[PDB]
Swiss-Prot record:
It is linked to Amyloidosis, hereditary systemic 4, Finnish type: A form of hereditary systemic amyloidosis, a disorder characterized by amyloid deposition in multiple tissues resulting in a wide clinical spectrum. AMYLD4 is due to gelsolin amyloid deposition and is typically characterized by cranial neuropathy and lattice corneal dystrophy. Most patients have modest involvement of internal organs, but severe systemic disease can develop in some individuals causing peripheral polyneuropathy, amyloid cardiomyopathy, and nephrotic syndrome leading to renal failure. Ca(2+) 7 binds at N153, D154, E176. The modification N6-acetyllysine is found at K146. This is Gelsolin. The gene is GSN. Phagocytic cells, platelets, fibroblasts, nonmuscle cells, smooth and skeletal muscle cells. Calcium-regulated, actin-modulating protein that binds to the plus (or barbed) ends of actin monomers or filaments, preventing monomer exchange (end-blocking or capping). It can promote the assembly of monomers into filaments (nucleation) as well as sever filaments already formed. Plays a role in ciliogenesis.
Length: 321
């Protein structure tokens, strides 16, 4: 998509069985607990086009998902079936979608709405993980404000009632730092700039006490061979290994299969709760084979992942399973 992403756009949010316009001042910020529809009008190479992006939040319920399907169908027909359709889940946005927000990063908030509870309120202390990919697309995902949630490869934003902090991992990029600043502009707070390893007491205090966090040599590395996740399965009747593209998300770990995470200087073998013994055995063979055709193979179990593994995921959640 050569289009520059500067066309007119309307973003509605799925609320109940309706779509509801989103504050146009906030376009670019989404609730991870919600589903969205983006009608994008553009003109490129002389022709006018239309894209509907159906954005599904990571914590979006099955009924919200069902509601956006009807809602899209309606919108499609209303526009006389002219536009291009694209279904997108959180963390797998194509470049073109990321560009719609004027170079600004996509901000994904904890929480959202539902039929029962309505709009959740934001917490008083909140932490954001700001990660950008190879191409400079940047995502600031809200996570739990604990010391353990940090990782050296990204920049973090911490916002308490009384203070703000911009924590920069040894491995964070300029894109990630710029992104952090934009989030802070949206949060309307002034940062205290903090480098990893020389944090003030107030910073650890705001996160509920200093603790170990997601770090490794590779996580710390500034230069960047970005890590690669593979799904290993034998559900189809024979063992197979396929790569998972886009941002590394907790949902990407198949709870009934084994996963390989190649961080170059280490291969992680993630074992699903509901995986079968054969799946792991084979995976250990395959990993050993990947390596031998050009390194520690660390074996990790669902729910018992070490900080060195989790750090590679954009926004982990201890109570996900
Ligand atoms: Ca929701
Ligand atoms: Ca990073
Ligand atoms: Ca399986």
């Amino acid at each position: 998509m050569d289009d520059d992403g500067t066309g007119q756009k309307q973003i509605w949010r799925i609320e109940g069985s309706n779509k509801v316009p989103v504050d146009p001042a906030t376009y670019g910020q989404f609730y991870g607990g919600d589903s969205y529809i983006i009608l994008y009008n553009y003109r490129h190479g002389g022709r006018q086009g239309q894209i509907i992006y159906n954005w599904q939040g990571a914590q979006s319920t099955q009924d919200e998902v069902a509601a956006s399907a009807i809602l899209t169908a309606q919108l499609d027909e209303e526009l006389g079936g002219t536009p291009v359709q694209s279904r997108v889940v959180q963390g797998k946005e194509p470049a073109h979608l990321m560009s719609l927000f004027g170079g600004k990063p996509m901000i994904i908030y904890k929480g959202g709405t539902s039929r029962e509870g309505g709009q959740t309120a934001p917490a008083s202390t909140r932490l954001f993980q700001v990660r950008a990919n190879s191409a400079g697309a940047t995502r600031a995902v809200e996570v739990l404000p604990k010391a353990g949630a940090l990782n050296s490869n990204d920049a973090f934003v911490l916002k308490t009632p009384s203070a703000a902090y911009l924590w920069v991992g040894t491995g964070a990029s300029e894109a990630e730092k710029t992104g952090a600043q934009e989030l802070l502009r949206v949060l309307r707070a002034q940062p205290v700039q903090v480098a990893e390893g020389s944090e003030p007491d107030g910073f650890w205090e705001a996160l509920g006490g200093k603790a170990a966090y997601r770090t490794s040599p590779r996580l710390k590395d500034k230069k960047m061979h970005p890590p690669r996740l593979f799904a290993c399965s034998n559900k189809i009747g024979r063992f197979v290994i396929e790569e998972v593209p886009g941002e590394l998300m907790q949902e990407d770990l198949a709870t009934d299969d084994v996963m390989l995470l190649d961080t170059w200087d280490q291969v992680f073998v993630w074992v699903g709760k509901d995986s079968q013994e054969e799946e792991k055995t084979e995976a250990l063979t395959s990993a050993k084979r990947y390596i031998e055709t050009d390194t520690p193979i660390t074996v990790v179990k669902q729910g018992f992942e070490p900080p060195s593994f989790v750090g590679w995921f954009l926004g982990w959640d201890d109570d996900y399973w």
